[PDB]
Amino acid sequence: PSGQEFLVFTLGDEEYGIDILKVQEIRGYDQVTRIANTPAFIKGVTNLRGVIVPIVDLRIKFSQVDVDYNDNTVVIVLNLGQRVVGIVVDGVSDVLSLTAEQIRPAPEFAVTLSTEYLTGLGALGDRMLILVNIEKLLNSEEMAL
């Protein structure tokens, strides 16, 4: 198949990647505007140049113990259709182009977790980056309840 290009980032002292096309902007994390009785995944909203953007907690979703504004310093702004949303992350690394041959199966034993959500591990120089299907994850997880 044709090569696939990923934006590579850190969460919980581990390395992850998502689709380059879906990324709008990468910005520094700053304080989130909060609304009461909201599901744990949603931090709140913030204003980017006159536009209100939802901010979501990737740390809680992947069961990582990192602290809100202390250990996470970057927001990656993602657009799916008419929805714009920022994922909270430690930092951003590089843009990486991967062939399908260098994508290894995810180690996880849960069925749709290790297929539909986790695309696999990108192998570069015997180092692994976790490839995440952000489109499937946001569409499924936010609309489950």
Binding site: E5, L7, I20, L21, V23, E25, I26, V92, D94, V95
Partner: protein
């Protein structure tokens, strides 16, 4: 001369103060290099969107990234020389204090 020893100690305090000021400016430059590196990564993402037309711009972004890393290395060399300079100020202060003793 006791006042000469005190005056040299005051001069040591001034160049210790200067060393922190030199450190403060290069620390800001170290931050500007960090901003430059993130901006180069944003440029690489922006280049990918424009495909064949962005390929030259991606080379330029790569060079900006090399310069940001080189600036950070240059900042570390200055920071290392400040660390050596700080040790020399304490050695000079110890020596001039010793020269007031004997």
């Amino acid at each position: 001369g006791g006042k000469v020893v005190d005056n040299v100690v005051q001069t040591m305090r001034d160049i210790s103060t200067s060393s922190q000021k030199i450190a403060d400016i290069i620390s800001v430059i170290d931050g500007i290099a960090f901003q430059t590196n993130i901006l180069a990564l944003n440029a690489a993402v922006e280049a990918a969107r424009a495909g064949e037309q962005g390929r030259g711009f991606a080379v330029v972004a790569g060079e900006v990234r090399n310069l940001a890393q080189r600036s950070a290395q240059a900042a570390r060399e200055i920071k290392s020389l400040i660390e050596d300079s700080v040790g020399k100020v304490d050695v000079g202060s110890t020596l001039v204090e010793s020269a007031g003793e004997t």
